[PDB]
């Protein structure tokens, strides 16, 4: 991955 | 604040 969130 | 990121 390597992009954060929340979603 | 309460959501995320990383910008
Ligand atoms: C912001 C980020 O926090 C850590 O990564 C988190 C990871 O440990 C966790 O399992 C997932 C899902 O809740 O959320 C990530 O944000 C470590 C990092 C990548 N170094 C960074 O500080
Ligand atoms: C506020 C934020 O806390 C840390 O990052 C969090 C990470 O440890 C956690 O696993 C995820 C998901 O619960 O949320 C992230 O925000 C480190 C940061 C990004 N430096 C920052 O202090």
Chains 1, 2 share one sequence.
Request: glycine share 0%.
């Amino acid at each position: 991955x390597x992009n954060x969130x929340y979603x």
